[PDB]
Design a protein around this ligand. Structure first.
Ligand code: AGS
Ligand code: AGS
Ligand code: ADP
Ligand code: MG
Ligand code: MG
Lengths: 108, 86, 284, 281, 280
């Protein structure tokens, strides 16, 4: 028998081992293949109560390749090293978010 | 002059529509319209259908997050009034 | 049992084996083009040759090189090339990609005839593969991985109507096929080998009809079998000839070997010549 | 060991250096075009010149400039330009983008030929990069960051069949390649350098076949190996020539260097001419 | 300090003046179109003339309304026309809007040989403005108040057949501008004024190439550093030309002012002639 350690979680895909740059590339590729609009969000604090995160620039309406999305994540990461960063996917027809996952956590 | 016929290969990939047929679950409206001098009939009808529904001539980032054809009123028929100008 | 000309066998054997060998300081052409008059035995003798050596063939039709999608015939040649490259790695034998009748694929005839971008891009793609055999890629998938070199055989009627930079000594080895008297005697003799004719008789057959393609003599045998077949149709009857060839649970009809003589063969050959002349001497 | 023509070398070296150097007042063209006759040494010689100077090359295929997606090939060029632009900032040396065989990608064959929207876009993209090399951005981005200038090398067969605004004095420096007597002697001399021929003999070979492309000499060079291979196939046998060459656990067959005499080479040269004459007829 | 031809200036003056003037009984063409060979300097002359006059200019790219992925030409030409009209009131000076390569620079091969959907839109938009210049309407926010009329200039190689109505109506004026000997001397003289060439020298250059575009003579100045660069490469050596220049912290390369002589220009001229000859 083993007792479970107390650890803070971050919604979807937070239980799996930390995502590699190849794995994040594959998840973003899924968003573009379905035809959803990718967007980057960032926040100072991670709380269950708050549901709005400050939008990074604007939604990427004209994205052809997954490399364009990852380049926008790296721009926000270099600017804000101590902020949480997540990737969201807007659907226009259903008018709802389809995928949302955290890509960066505050360094030290 | 040299004219030719051809076969081709293909690469592949908004308010006044007279082709549209009204549905059984639609709200229909009749307007008696009088435009200002120097304004076309089809332009005036398209202006009424736009301004009474959603408006939105210029597309913003918020507008692209939704369907544009789903929530939109359209003009489908123009009929002239007998013995009257414009 | 068919005769293959030694000239034709040597030219094919050398070009293919040379590509798989890596002789240092030798630049080798990837594509072998064979061109000549119609029905001289370009395609047929290839299929005899590949069967003898027991090497794998991938076939591209000439009329396949046009589609309603832009740069889709160009995509096909790359795909078929990569599939052949896998066969060498797995099966462990020589493999050959063969594009037959390329003249009708990517050639311009007159000035009036309107064409499409695909013709331009098919010729573009064939030049690239000839340049870089190891590096063939697909659109949307870029991976740095070398693949094995595959030789290509091309058959055509006329090469004059084809993009010039694609036909040069470095990029493509050229071969003209026009069989001589000795080649004719050997090939025709190979067709009638089972029938049993003397050497002098076979000489006479070529002498009587000298300005003739190989196909002429293979077409000659078909006309000798007419009488036997016609008589068979009559005995069965026209009413129920159909339900006796397609789906019948009976032993197939047997035919005896007709009297293969010089006199009979000559008469038949004269009749075919008359049939050819009729189409040539037509008004409108 | 291969000879590069000084004319060809000096033309490349200036254009590439001039792009990286900044001289006030002077307008410098971004693209250099090399055009001439088939198999005269346009692609081959560029490779040699990029080896001696030791510079990084980004290649684009000719027939890559059309896709069953609208916009897609035009996006390809901008992406490859920016990838080469980053390489300069990282590696710390010259980098060049070469598009080979641009005649069969964008070039209008004739009036008859019908084109799509993709061919329109590729001409439209190349005009933009040639005007604003420092300011290149992808269609629909929020970056807009000044990037490094990258010179472009372009090779083709006929520039007469190529969009007219692209071939302009300020936009593209054109260059015509045609080897002379001295140039031929040098190059052909470089091919047969291991063979061992006297100067007089080399002169005679060029004199015999004066109106010939460079590839023509390489064709006969490679051909002085046919008899050896043919003899090898016969001894092994036709029935087992595939297993003896593909999946063999033996030693590769060695081939002794054939006789390279002027009389034998002229004989072989006449044979190749005879093959071309037969096609021509 | 570039020379302007008197004829070119006159044609611009009269068109702009007459439109702004308010003389009764007189009809004036709104649109002026200029057609000529490429690298004649039609665009360059227009920009210069406006500076001397001091009149504000609005420029619209030919490729900006020709591209399929640009927007809407019909909505664009209207928007630019209104904005130019606002300048007159605020700025208090004459304002002109001009278009370059209306049927060119799109990337298409035809160059007005075959019409497009986009080609039709410009014709439609222009015709509406030419008939009713005083009132121009956007999709929304229709204003009753009139706008000041604005002159339009257009430059190209040639004009399409679709425009023939306007020209017959006399609503459009077509000017064909071709350079002469006197014009050549002026333009060539202005380019090389800073270098310092005698009158006799300038005459010789034009005489060497009697049938040449204006662009060619301007392009000659660029190939003066070629000898210096070629000689420089040799001292450095081919092995390491790149590394020193591309990404190394050293003194930047220094070039002495090129000597200007007629002999050098003739030699350079011949090379460009040869290249252009072989390409076409
Ligand atoms: N060597 C042969 N032995 C027996 N029959 C042959 C032989 N050569 C040709 N034939 C016959 O003649 C026909 C000639 O076929 P091909 O090889 O297609 O000629 P071809 O020159 O390739 O035709 P083109 O130019 O593509 S229309 C064959 O199908 C055989 O029936
Ligand atoms: N300088 C050289 N030294 C040794 N071999 C050369 C040399 N130049 C050309 N060759 C040979 O001739 C061939 C010519 O190749 P290319 O440079 O591709 O010709 P090209 O002018 O680009 O032909 P097109 O117009 O693209 S088809 C090479 O593959 C070599 O075999
Ligand atoms: N009067 C002039 N003085 C100096 N350069 C001129 C003059 N006219 C034209 N040019 C040159 O012409 C080129 C631009 O040509 P452009 O005005 O676009 O001509 P076009 O519109 O007829 O094609 C520039 O290199 C510019 O220096
Ligand atoms: Mg055949
Ligand atoms: Mg080449």
């Amino acid at each position: 028998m083993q007792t479970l350690p107390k650890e803070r979680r971050y919604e979807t895909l937070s239980y799996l081992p930390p995502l590699t740059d190849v794995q994040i590339e594959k998840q973003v590729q899924y968003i573009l293949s379905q035809g959803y609009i990718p967007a980057v969000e960032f926040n100072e604090v991670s709380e269950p109560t708050e549901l709005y995160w400050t939008l990074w620039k604007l939604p990427l309406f004209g994205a052809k390749t997954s490399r364009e999305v990852l380049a926008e994540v790296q721009s926000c990461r270099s600017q804000y090293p101590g902020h949480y960063i997540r990737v969201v996917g807007f659907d226009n027809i259903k008018q709802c978010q389809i995928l949302s996952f955290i890509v960066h956590k505050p360094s030290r | 002059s040299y004219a030719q016929t051809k076969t081709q290969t293909k690469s592949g990939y908004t308010y006044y529509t007279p082709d549209y047929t009204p549905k059984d679950t639609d709200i229909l409206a009749a307007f008696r319209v009088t435009p200002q001098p120097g304004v076309p009939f089809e332009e005036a009808a398209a202006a009424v259908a736009a301004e009474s529904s959603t408006g939105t001539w210029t597309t913003v980032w918020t507008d692209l997050l939704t369907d544009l054809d789903r929530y939109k009123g359209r003009c489908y028929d123009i009929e002239p009034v007998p013995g009257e100008d414009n | 049992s068919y005769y293959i000309a030694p000239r034709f066998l040597d030219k094919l054997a050398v070009h293919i084996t040379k590509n798989f060998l890596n002789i240092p300081g030798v630049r080798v052409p990837l594509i072998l083009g064979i061109h000549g008059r119609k029905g001289e035995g370009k395609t047929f003798q290839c299929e005899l040759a590949f069967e003898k050596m027991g090497i794998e063939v991938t076939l591209i039709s000439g009329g396949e090189l046009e589609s309603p999608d832009a740069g889709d015939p160009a995509r096909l040649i790359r795909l078929r090339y990569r599939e052949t490259a896998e066969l060498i790695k797995v099966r462990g034998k020589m493999c050959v990609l063969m594009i037959n009748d390329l003249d009708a694929g990517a050639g311009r005839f007159d000035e009036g005839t309107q064409y499409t971008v695909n013709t331009q891009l098919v010729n573009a793609t064939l030049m690239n593969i000839a340049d870089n055999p190891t590096d063939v890629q697909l659109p949307g998938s870029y991976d740095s991985n070398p693949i094995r070199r595959v030789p290509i055989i091309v058959t055509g009627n006329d090469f004059s109507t084809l993009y010039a930079p694609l036909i040069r000594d470095g990029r493509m080895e050229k071969f003209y096929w026009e069989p001589n008297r000795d080649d004719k005697v050997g090939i025709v003799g190979g067709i009638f080998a089972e029938d049993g004719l003397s050497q002098r008789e076979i000489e006479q057959l070529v002498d009587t009809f000298p300005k003739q393609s190989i196909d002429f003599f293979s077409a000659l045998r078909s006309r000798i079998y007419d009488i036997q077949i016609r008589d068979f149709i009559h005995k069965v009857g026209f009413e129920r000839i159909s339900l006796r060839v397609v789906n019948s649970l009976e032993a197939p009809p047997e035919f005896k070997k007709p009297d293969f003589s010089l006199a009979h063969l000559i008469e038949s050959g004269n009749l075919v010549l008359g049939e050819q002349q009729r189409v040539d001497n037509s008004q409108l």
